[PDB]
Design an enzyme around this catalytic site. Structure first.
Site, PDB file in Angstrom:
ATOM      1  N   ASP A 133       7.327   2.435  -4.583  1.00 55.04           N
ATOM      2  CA  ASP A 133       6.501   3.178  -5.301  1.00 55.04           C
ATOM      3  C   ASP A 133       6.383   3.247  -7.191  1.00 55.04           C
ATOM      4  OD1 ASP A 133       3.604   2.944  -6.039  1.00 55.04           O
ATOM      5  OD2 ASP A 133       4.128   5.002  -7.235  1.00 55.04           O
ATOM      6  N   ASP A 134       6.498   2.614  -7.840  1.00 48.79           N
ATOM      7  CA  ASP A 134       6.009   2.024  -9.121  1.00 48.79           C
ATOM      8  C   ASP A 134       5.003   2.966 -10.053  1.00 48.79           C
ATOM      9  OD1 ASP A 134       7.066   1.844 -11.958  1.00 48.79           O
ATOM     10  OD2 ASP A 134       7.695  -0.349 -11.988  1.00 48.79           O
ATOM     11  N   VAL A 137       3.137   0.479 -12.002  1.00 44.05           N
ATOM     12  CA  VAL A 137       1.615  -0.091 -11.001  1.00 44.05           C
ATOM     13  C   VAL A 137       0.399   1.119  -9.861  1.00 44.05           C
ATOM     14  CG1 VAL A 137       2.322  -2.758  -9.764  1.00 44.05           C
ATOM     15  CG2 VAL A 137       4.039  -1.709 -10.928  1.00 44.05           C
ATOM     16  N   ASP A 193       6.010  -1.671  -4.989  1.00 49.59           N
ATOM     17  CA  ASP A 193       6.045  -2.680  -6.066  1.00 49.59           C
ATOM     18  C   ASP A 193       6.961  -3.098  -6.210  1.00 49.59           C
ATOM     19  OD1 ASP A 193       3.065  -0.668  -6.199  1.00 49.59           O
ATOM     20  OD2 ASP A 193       4.297   0.390  -7.429  1.00 49.59           O
ATOM     21  N   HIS A 200      11.422 -14.614  -0.794  1.00 50.02           N
ATOM     22  CA  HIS A 200      12.653 -14.649   0.336  1.00 50.02           C
ATOM     23  C   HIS A 200      13.441 -14.322  -0.120  1.00 50.02           C
ATOM     24  CE1 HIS A 200      10.095 -17.521   2.590  1.00 50.02           C
ATOM     25  NE2 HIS A 200      10.532 -18.307   1.437  1.00 50.02           N
ATOM     26  N   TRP A 342       6.735 -20.393   9.840  1.00 46.31           N
ATOM     27  CA  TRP A 342       7.210 -21.277   9.031  1.00 46.31           C
ATOM     28  C   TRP A 342       8.746 -21.948   9.766  1.00 46.31           C
ATOM     29  CZ3 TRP A 342       7.756 -25.268   5.006  1.00 46.31           C
ATOM     30  CH2 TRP A 342       8.820 -25.262   5.038  1.00 46.31           C
ATOM     31  N   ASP A 366      -3.406 -22.548  -1.691  1.00 45.40           N
ATOM     32  CA  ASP A 366      -3.515 -22.301  -0.307  1.00 45.40           C
ATOM     33  C   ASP A 366      -5.097 -21.422   0.464  1.00 45.40           C
ATOM     34  OD1 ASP A 366      -2.272 -23.692   0.831  1.00 45.40           O
ATOM     35  OD2 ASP A 366      -0.786 -22.712   0.963  1.00 45.40           O
ATOM     36  N   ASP A 373       1.616 -24.110   9.610  1.00 44.08           N
ATOM     37  CA  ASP A 373       3.212 -24.642   8.919  1.00 44.08           C
ATOM     38  C   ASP A 373       3.944 -26.083   8.856  1.00 44.08           C
ATOM     39  OD1 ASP A 373       4.015 -25.397   5.957  1.00 44.08           O
ATOM     40  OD2 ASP A 373       2.963 -24.008   5.730  1.00 44.08           O
TER      41      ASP A 373
HETATM   42 NA    NA Z   1       2.295   1.259  -7.822  1.00 47.44          NA
END
Ligand code: NA
EC number: 3.2.1.140
Length: 582
Positions: A133-134, A137, A193, A200, A342, A366, A373
């Site tokens: 967590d942040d 955010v 977060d 990737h 993928w 999408d 895909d």
């Molecule tokens: Na958060």
């Protein structure tokens, strides 16, 4: 057979750490020993524990097959699973580097990971709860709505492109060796977060991925790398919940060795020995719930015959919109689908549910539940989709080939059910039941290419006899139809000479439109039989024109017809749609 205990609340780091009497206080201690563990060794965290600003990295070690490394819980179940919470701290941060171009993407950089498994085999993690967590955010999925003003909802996001990548769990193979027999069971990952954009990097709930051990700079690096492959085998991820994570919910198998897998796209077929050597084998992804990922729910990449079953995806693509995805740079990627593959070979996606993939109205290019895909031999069967913002199923561009999609049910998927943009050949779409509301239609507007439609029940769930567009485009022969049922339509596909036409859906099935509109609160999958059976509305009624009306099907991709949506054996001449009459 050593066994460590970590408490906090009762613990003390001066202790021996062995035995239940003398538990460690912190996970700092686990990390000092972590590289020496240990076939038959274990590390049990105490139910109730809260390891704030901590993390558990495990690098370059293994079990054997008779005794894996554990990492689990101890004490009273009822005190709640032990929390490991790294809160982004300096210790959890490591330099990630694929050591090769892996396409138009961040391939290199700082990553916070709460539980890192770098080249650890025969390990099993269970009964934990993982955050990254942040406090800056907060945009929870349980109360997320689209508003006219960004972060209106008492919510707050970090829209920086350079935001530090964060993971809940990362498994990393970067020694040129296989990493094997990794099992993740009953984990509860949330509030990771991460970076809104990066696809990737180890960025989101759970991410497995493989790197070259060194940069490929010479004849001699290229001989070695060709033989010595960071890859995965027997990875199993089950009974877990991932929730409120950016970007990816659950992703497995991305690799620097795509430089060999994707060297020659050819016709989109994928050689069995190529994908076996350079790709990940025996990946299984079972009985998971994914909710409120910023991007895609669950995605298998560069995997050889993975199995994806009984998972439930729900309300993903939360940050794939114009008010949250504001810094795409030259990387792009304002797109996400639900549960998909993928560049896999013959993946099987079965008995999944996908709900309410979000934000195709607001910038998600999408927004589909399922997406065959680029890849070869994808099998989607016995899946249910509801309420996705853009289609049930996409078949995506030239190198998406040999798709089967059967015995699935699509209910109130919006703006088209089937999305066929410039896809390759070999696609077979049969025995599905689609309920198409006024917010949708059979094909997406951008559809233009191949699919063979057979034995399906298409339901015009509107208040007029609709004149439907059955055909768009002709690329790869376009859309052909044979032996399908059309309910409450004015027209039919010109290509179907075995049309069954019904006026009224109530004489065809028990209660169309009545399958769930939401995931179960627990995140487990709905029952299909017994007292709680959620799908009995899609059963044919007595005297239904769907009984014994289907042709015997010959699967374009050699998958034998076995059962229907509800586990019933398909008899001789099949019924139309996804559900046999009892
Ligand atoms: Na958060």
């Amino acid at each position: 057979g050593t066994t460590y205990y970590v408490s906090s609340a009762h613990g003390d780091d001066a202790n021996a750490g062995t035995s239940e009497n003398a538990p460690w206080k912190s996970l700092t201690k686990v990390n000092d020993i972590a590289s020496d563990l240990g076939p038959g060794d274990s590390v049990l965290l105490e139910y109730g524990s809260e390891f704030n600003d901590q993390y558990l990295h495990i690098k370059d070690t293994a079990g054997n097959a008779d005794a894996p490394i554990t990492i689990s819980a101890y004490g009273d179940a009822d005190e709640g699973k032990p929390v490991i919470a790294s809160n982004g701290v300096k210790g959890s941060q490591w330099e990630q580097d694929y050591r090769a171009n892996v396409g138009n993407h961040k391939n290199k950089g700082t990553v916070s990971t709460t539980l890192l498994l770098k080249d650890v085999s025969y390990i099993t993690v269970s009964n934990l709860e993982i955050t990254n967590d942040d406090a800056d955010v907060y945009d929870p999925i349980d109360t997320w709505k689209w508003t006219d003003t960004p972060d209106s909802d008492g919510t707050k996001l970090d829209r920086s492109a350079s935001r530090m990548d964060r993971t809940g769990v990362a498994g990393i193979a970067e020694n040129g060796a296989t990493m094997s027999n990794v099992t993740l069971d009953n984990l509860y990952i949330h509030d990771v977060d991460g970076n809104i954009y990066n696809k990737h990097m180890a960025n989101g709930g759970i991410y497995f991925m493989a790197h070259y051990p060194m940069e490929n700079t010479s004849a001699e690096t290229d001989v070695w790398l060709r033989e010595h492959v960071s890859r995965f085998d027997h990875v199993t991820i089950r009974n877990s919940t991932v929730k409120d994570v950016d970007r990816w919910g659950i992703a497995v198998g991305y690799t620097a060795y795509l430089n060999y897998i994707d060297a020659n796209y050819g016709d989109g077929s994928i050689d069995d020995a190529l994908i076996a050597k350079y790709g990940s084998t025996n990946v299984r992804i079972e009985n998971n719930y994914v909710k409120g990922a910023g991007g895609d729910a669950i995605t298998l990449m560069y995997c050889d015959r993975p199995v994806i079953e009984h998972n439930v995806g729900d309300s993903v693509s939360k940050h794939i919109n114009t008010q949250d995805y504001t810094q795409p740079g030259s990387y792009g990627g304002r797109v996400a689908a639900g549960i998909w593959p993928w560049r896999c070979k013959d993946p099987v996606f079965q008995y999944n549910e996908m709900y309410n993939n979000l934000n195709a109205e607001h910038g998600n290019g999408d927004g589909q539940a399922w997406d065959a895909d680029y890849g070869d031999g994808t099998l989607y069967q016995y899946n249910y989709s509801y309420g996705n913002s853009f289609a049930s199923l996409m078949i995506c561009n030239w190198y998406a080939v040999n798709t089967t999609f059967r015995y699935n049910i699509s209910q109130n998927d919006r703006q088209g059910v089937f999305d066929l943009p410039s896809n390759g050949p070999g696609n077979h779409i049969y025995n599905n039941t689609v309920y198409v509301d006024a917010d949708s239609q059979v094909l997406t507007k951008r559809s233009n290419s191949q699919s063979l439609f057979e034995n399906n029940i298409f339901i015009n769930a509107t208040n007029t006899k609709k004149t439907e567009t059955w055909n768009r485009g002709s690329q790869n022969g376009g859309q052909t139809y044979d032996n399908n049922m059309y309910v409450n339509y004015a027209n039919k596909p010109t290509s179907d000479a075995n049309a069954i036409e019904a006026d009224d859906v109530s004489a065809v099935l028990a209660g169309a439109g009545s399958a769930p509109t939401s995931a179960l609160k627990s995140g487990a999958e709905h029952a299909r039989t017994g007292e709680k059976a959620a799908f009995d509305g899609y059963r044919p009624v007595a005297g239904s024109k769907a009984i014994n009306a289907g042709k015997v099907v010959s699967d374009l991709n050699d998958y034998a017809v076995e059962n229907d949506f509800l586990g019933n054996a398909v008899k001789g001449r099949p019924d139309l749609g996804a559900v046999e009459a009892a």
